[PDB]
Amino acid sequence: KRPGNKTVLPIMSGFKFHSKPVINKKPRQAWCWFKGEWKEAMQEVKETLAKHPRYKGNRSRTENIKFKAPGRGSDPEAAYMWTNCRGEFLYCNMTWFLNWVDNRTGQKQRNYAPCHIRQIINTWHRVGKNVYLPPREGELTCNSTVTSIIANIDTGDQTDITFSAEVAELYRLELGDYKLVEI
Amino acid sequence: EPCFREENANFNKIFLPTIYSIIFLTGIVGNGLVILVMGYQKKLRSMTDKYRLHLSVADLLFVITLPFWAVDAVANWYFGNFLCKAVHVIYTVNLYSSVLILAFISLDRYLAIVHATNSQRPRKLLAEKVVYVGVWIPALLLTIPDFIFANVSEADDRYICDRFYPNDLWVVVFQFQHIMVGLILPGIVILSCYCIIISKLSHSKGHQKRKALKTTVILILAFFACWLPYYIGISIDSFILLEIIKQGCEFENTVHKWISITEALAFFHCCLNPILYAFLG
Amino acid sequence: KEPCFREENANFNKIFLPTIYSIIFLTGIVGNGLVILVMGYQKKLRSMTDKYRLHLSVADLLFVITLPFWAVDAVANWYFGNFLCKAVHVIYTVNLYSSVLILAFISLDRYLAIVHATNSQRPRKLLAEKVVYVGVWIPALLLTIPDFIFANVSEADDRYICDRFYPNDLWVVVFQFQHIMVGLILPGIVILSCYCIIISKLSHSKGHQKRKALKTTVILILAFFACWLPYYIGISIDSFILLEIIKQGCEFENTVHKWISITEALAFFHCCLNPILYAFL
Amino acid sequence: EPCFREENANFNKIFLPTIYSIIFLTGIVGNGLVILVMGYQKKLRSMTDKYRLHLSVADLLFVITLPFWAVDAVANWYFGNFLCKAVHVIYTVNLYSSVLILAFISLDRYLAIVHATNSQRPRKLLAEKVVYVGVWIPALLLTIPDFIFANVSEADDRYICDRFYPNDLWVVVFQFQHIMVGLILPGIVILSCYCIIISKLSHSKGHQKRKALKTTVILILAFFACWLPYYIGISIDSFILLEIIKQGCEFENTVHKWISITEALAFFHCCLNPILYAFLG
Amino acid sequence: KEPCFREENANFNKIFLPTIYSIIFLTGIVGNGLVILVMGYQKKLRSMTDKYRLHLSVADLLFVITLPFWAVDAVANWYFGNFLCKAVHVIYTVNLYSSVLILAFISLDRYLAIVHATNSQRPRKLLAEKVVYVGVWIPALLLTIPDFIFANVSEADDRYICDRFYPNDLWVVVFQFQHIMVGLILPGIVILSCYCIIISKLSHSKGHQKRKALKTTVILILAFFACWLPYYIGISIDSFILLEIIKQGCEFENTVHKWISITEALAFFHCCLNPILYAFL
């Protein structure tokens, strides 16, 4: 949800009974809350990775299995979020939610992410960029259920599950069991 | 902090129209007796009496419409917009013309004691004809921004007869000029001419007589000490509305309760002529 | 929806009602016993309006002996029977009505005394002796048949409140409607009419020494109306709460109940001031 | 209810020493000026003045020690048992003897107006010999229990100087006997005295002459007006300690706060002799 | 061991302080300007006390320059520099000491006028002219130097308040006690000793009419002390709260702060009454 300019009853300004609304100083700042039993889901993901036969790490422990963000200087779509919320494209820093999931003590842990809008996004299919309109005013809200994860899992001394921006992997998930055949 | 929220205390809605009813009863009886003993019968003694009859008839035209303010104090209207226009313009014209007339009587006393010799015809013509262009016409042209801008509006769950300006900047400049015409500039004129009055009185202590300036003095001091906290409260409302001294919603509705109580207590200017006539003071 | 919800009653009212009741009971007993003993028993009449002051004093006795029953009804509730609750309510209503009717009669008396100063010298004695008793005492007793019937004591959580009760709230609000009209407006309109006529006809006089006696009468009526006005506005607003006009302030409704109790206490200065006007002149 | 509690409200913790201090300084100044102009100089004229000397002396020996209560209202009584005993016995003797001599001057005016001829030596008898045995002797023999039961106490943190009794019924025995000797029987005695005074003064309306009663009338009225809410407060506290008017704990706490503020208001009774002397009223 | 328990809730006070500051501002500027324009500008002194009233008028003039700055400090927080903050506080000190020193001087004037009325006439003129300036003005200027040293503007969350600041609590203790001693106890003992000697010597006099001019002086000093006094007890308690005699009342301490603001508001009335006692006789 991205808040806009807070409003009051229209005009109603006079000698008596006058109110002042609240303007939106940052039209680009948004918010994104992820709800549910997230840590239980992520330890179920760790248990499934330990269940997987192609995981070359220590399957007897899941504490070494960690979810890591890519390093700085990388893509805005690969480091931060990229999703469409009613015509606008959200970019959220994944420090607080990733620290809250992984319980990394000594840093900032929160169940949401601080978000900034971007009118300029990359292209996941072709090579290029797209520049959009300035964002619409008012209230901007979106609601969906998280169902899958785009990531890459490196096997070494420690298991660093590195999240990627492979948008095509969602459709490869959804249509991987189906295969076209010709009778 | 979403916005400022309107929550009036319940003691406002019950202490308020009792005060309006008190001033209504004493105003009707006092202005009625004063106009019927003076204007209907022409029993004048000095030129001050005509000035105070002009003050009394503006006060009377106020206290026709005073119970509509009493109705607005506790409840919401069903009459219409035209009566709201009439009550607001009559409020503005009496509020301006009262301190105007109170300035004219002060300059009349200044002409009385300082230019005691070479002023008989100017006092007579001033009390006869000049106050009609000096009092009502500037006051009624000051009612035109109330006449062509104000309206009723529905705050959804109730009907309100009050002021509605295009922006808060209009509000602060209108109250600012309202203060300049209501307290400050007539106050400077009145107090300066009273300085000159007492300065010339100090030269004539050898013959006293008189004991007649005390009525005008208690009138001006009663009016100013009656009207002062209303101006102070709306100046505080001005300073928070021009966002210099922002403090929160609790200070805003504290100022609003304050200005309501001070205007209710400040309308005792209706009951300042006839009780002083009855006390002969 | 929202029920009556008056199960919150006060404490500062329960402390401050009895002390004003006791000071008014002491001053009513003392001053009214003194004025009856000096004037009605010993026949020390010099003027003729004093007889009407005696009748007002008699009504003040009828209020002040029954006043500590109102005090124990304030702190406790009734422990002394439905008959005595009927007695205190009927004597409350007859003294409250007889006070304003004898003030209307002294109003008409000063009007006939000064306007008809040539021919009304036997009619003033006629209205002193004959028509005054059927003028004030008979209507006050005959209007209290509902005060005889509806008054009772009702059971509660071991309270036994002494209160009048009606078949519905419609009978209640029409009772305070008739109460407000023939308690304020008709005596008020006849008092204001004859008094504005008496000021308009004293204006034909050149400030004589017969105007030195009006001041007691006018401070009497203005003190009486100033004391009984806020209770009158309170009963007007409380009646306007019912019959579905103002249905928003239920918290405002029991604050109106608190205010109406405290102004019902504070309206009792009328019995104090009759010997206070003899302490002064 | 789990239990009961003790709690002083926060506002009177600063408000009571202010009233205590202002009445302390005006009491010492007025009483000292009265004794210096009258007792040391022997400049008294009438027989009332000697009673005014006695009032001033008792008022002094109350008011110089009143700052100990001004300290102990907010602070802790680390002074001593003997000091608490002394201040309590002198508070009670100055509460009693003032009412006693105020009854005595009513008796003196009674003897003045009706027995103006056949009593001259009784005036000096009741002003010289009867005063010692009938004022200070009863006001000392009524103050044995606060000589013999009074003590300080450390109840939890607080060092308390306060009137302490073995059980609750002794408190209401004291309070009932206290109101009946402090207000009630002087009430009837003084009321009968002035009733007969005005009843036989009405026989001589043709010779008004002196009107020296007005000083004593203003004194008795102001004294009773200052002391009456304290009496009704201690009556209400007696009635709640007979557990007949039970409502809850916070009602009795508000009764306690009412007792504190009404005793503070009843301490105004000190400066009524010297203020009326300074006004020559 | 809570250090401060910082709060904000003074919303009623933040509007009650500027309106009282403004009314004292207006009545002080008119009264002081008129009294200097009559007394000092054209030499209308009839007694030697008029020079004292002239100097007190100069002091109250200097205070009614700075009352609008006190109003801005009441509503908002201070904006205009440490030098102007020091100026406001230093003339606050010279008023608060010069008023009591010059009223002790008029006490000495009246004492020497009534006691040594034969051998002391030239020393009366000597104290009227010569030693009066070095008596009132420069001792206050000696006392002003901790205000210039310690009081300044401090750092807050965009407030920059103008108060008096000290390195620790010990300086707060010593300067508030020395302020209350030099404000209360020596002028109090000299005023009461001198006045009791005046009225003791007046007892030998045969009720002469030379105490008619004494009446204005006594009502001046008593109105002055009734003005300045609850602030004195409040600051006595606020000095007494330190050095841990009472430490449990943090909310009590905040109540003391609110009451000390309200008693400053009440105790700034003394500049109003000095020309009001010339408006009345």
Tab-separated table of C-alpha atoms in Angstrom, chain D residues 72-189:
chain	number	residue	atom	x	y	z
D	72	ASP	CA	1.969	20.245	58.108
D	73	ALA	CA	-0.570	20.552	55.277
D	74	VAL	CA	2.135	19.564	52.800
D	75	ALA	CA	5.040	18.433	55.016
D	76	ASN	CA	5.465	15.998	57.909
D	77	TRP	CA	4.935	16.822	61.590
D	78	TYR	CA	8.420	16.260	62.965
D	79	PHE	CA	7.727	18.924	65.614
D	80	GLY	CA	6.525	16.946	68.619
D	81	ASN	CA	3.643	15.506	70.579
D	82	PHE	CA	3.341	18.517	72.888
D	83	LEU	CA	3.175	20.984	69.995
D	84	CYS	CA	0.387	18.984	68.330
D	85	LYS	CA	-1.500	18.835	71.638
D	86	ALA	CA	-1.076	22.581	72.136
D	87	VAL	CA	-2.196	23.576	68.641
D	88	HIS	CA	-5.250	21.313	68.829
D	89	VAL	CA	-6.394	22.617	72.227
D	90	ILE	CA	-5.938	26.210	71.141
D	91	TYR	CA	-7.806	25.608	67.878
D	92	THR	CA	-10.707	24.196	69.840
D	93	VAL	CA	-10.743	26.963	72.457
D	94	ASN	CA	-10.724	29.603	69.730
D	95	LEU	CA	-13.461	27.767	67.878
D	96	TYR	CA	-15.589	27.729	71.035
D	97	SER	CA	-14.965	31.086	72.719
D	98	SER	CA	-15.593	33.183	69.609
D	99	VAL	CA	-19.098	31.760	69.292
D	100	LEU	CA	-19.554	32.179	73.052
D	101	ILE	CA	-18.751	35.890	73.032
D	102	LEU	CA	-20.706	36.323	69.828
D	103	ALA	CA	-23.692	35.026	71.751
D	104	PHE	CA	-22.702	37.325	74.608
D	105	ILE	CA	-22.815	40.450	72.457
D	106	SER	CA	-26.248	39.443	71.203
D	107	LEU	CA	-27.288	39.165	74.833
D	108	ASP	CA	-25.648	42.555	75.421
D	109	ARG	CA	-27.613	44.211	72.620
D	110	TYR	CA	-30.760	42.479	73.889
D	111	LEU	CA	-30.100	43.998	77.311
D	112	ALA	CA	-29.312	47.308	75.625
D	113	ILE	CA	-32.482	47.806	73.614
D	114	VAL	CA	-35.245	46.560	75.914
D	115	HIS	CA	-33.677	47.024	79.374
D	116	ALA	CA	-32.249	50.438	78.578
D	117	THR	CA	-33.397	51.928	81.896
D	118	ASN	CA	-33.341	49.277	84.630
D	119	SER	CA	-29.878	47.827	83.977
D	120	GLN	CA	-26.605	49.744	84.124
D	121	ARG	CA	-24.590	47.729	86.653
D	122	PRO	CA	-25.612	44.454	84.878
D	123	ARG	CA	-23.702	45.693	81.803
D	124	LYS	CA	-20.425	45.960	83.692
D	125	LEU	CA	-21.274	42.717	85.498
D	126	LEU	CA	-21.688	40.742	82.284
D	127	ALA	CA	-18.722	42.545	80.707
D	128	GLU	CA	-16.275	42.230	83.622
D	129	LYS	CA	-17.070	39.316	85.945
D	130	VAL	CA	-19.348	36.999	83.963
D	131	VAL	CA	-16.970	36.877	80.966
D	132	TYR	CA	-14.169	34.915	82.673
D	133	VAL	CA	-16.421	32.244	84.144
D	134	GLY	CA	-18.775	31.983	81.171
D	135	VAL	CA	-16.376	32.141	78.213
D	136	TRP	CA	-12.928	30.782	78.994
D	137	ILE	CA	-13.950	28.340	81.748
D	138	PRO	CA	-16.450	26.394	79.560
D	139	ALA	CA	-14.067	26.619	76.631
D	140	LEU	CA	-11.346	25.100	78.764
D	141	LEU	CA	-13.459	22.379	80.375
D	142	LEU	CA	-14.731	21.360	76.929
D	143	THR	CA	-11.080	20.904	75.905
D	144	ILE	CA	-10.012	18.150	78.273
D	145	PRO	CA	-10.244	15.323	75.628
D	146	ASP	CA	-7.836	17.025	73.254
D	147	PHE	CA	-5.493	17.630	76.174
D	148	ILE	CA	-5.602	13.993	77.252
D	149	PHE	CA	-5.988	11.966	74.024
D	150	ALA	CA	-3.986	13.949	71.450
D	151	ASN	CA	-0.821	12.373	70.047
D	152	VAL	CA	1.388	12.347	66.976
D	153	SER	CA	1.767	9.218	64.874
D	154	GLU	CA	4.038	7.810	62.187
D	155	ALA	CA	1.519	6.012	59.982
D	156	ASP	CA	3.716	4.391	57.292
D	157	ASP	CA	5.836	7.273	55.933
D	158	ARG	CA	3.879	10.238	57.246
D	159	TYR	CA	4.375	12.006	60.564
D	160	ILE	CA	0.775	13.044	61.240
D	161	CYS	CA	-0.491	15.677	63.667
D	162	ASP	CA	-4.195	14.910	63.683
D	163	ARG	CA	-7.077	14.384	66.102
D	164	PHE	CA	-6.985	10.693	67.074
D	165	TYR	CA	-9.775	8.714	68.830
D	166	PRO	CA	-10.100	5.132	70.157
D	167	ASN	CA	-13.050	4.199	67.928
D	168	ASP	CA	-15.495	5.601	65.403
D	169	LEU	CA	-18.417	6.371	67.714
D	170	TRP	CA	-16.367	8.801	69.809
D	171	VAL	CA	-15.809	10.760	66.586
D	172	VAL	CA	-19.499	11.155	65.883
D	173	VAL	CA	-20.256	11.869	69.545
D	174	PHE	CA	-17.741	14.726	69.324
D	175	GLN	CA	-19.094	15.875	65.968
D	176	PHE	CA	-22.723	15.866	67.058
D	177	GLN	CA	-21.949	17.631	70.323
D	178	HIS	CA	-19.633	19.944	68.410
D	179	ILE	CA	-22.243	21.114	65.931
D	180	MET	CA	-24.882	21.375	68.672
D	181	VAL	CA	-22.757	23.630	70.905
D	182	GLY	CA	-21.009	25.473	68.095
D	183	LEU	CA	-23.921	26.283	65.804
D	184	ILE	CA	-27.230	24.991	67.092
D	185	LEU	CA	-27.793	26.269	70.640
D	186	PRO	CA	-26.013	29.591	69.915
D	187	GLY	CA	-28.221	29.604	66.841
D	188	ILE	CA	-31.439	29.587	68.868
D	189	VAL	CA	-30.006	31.921	71.546
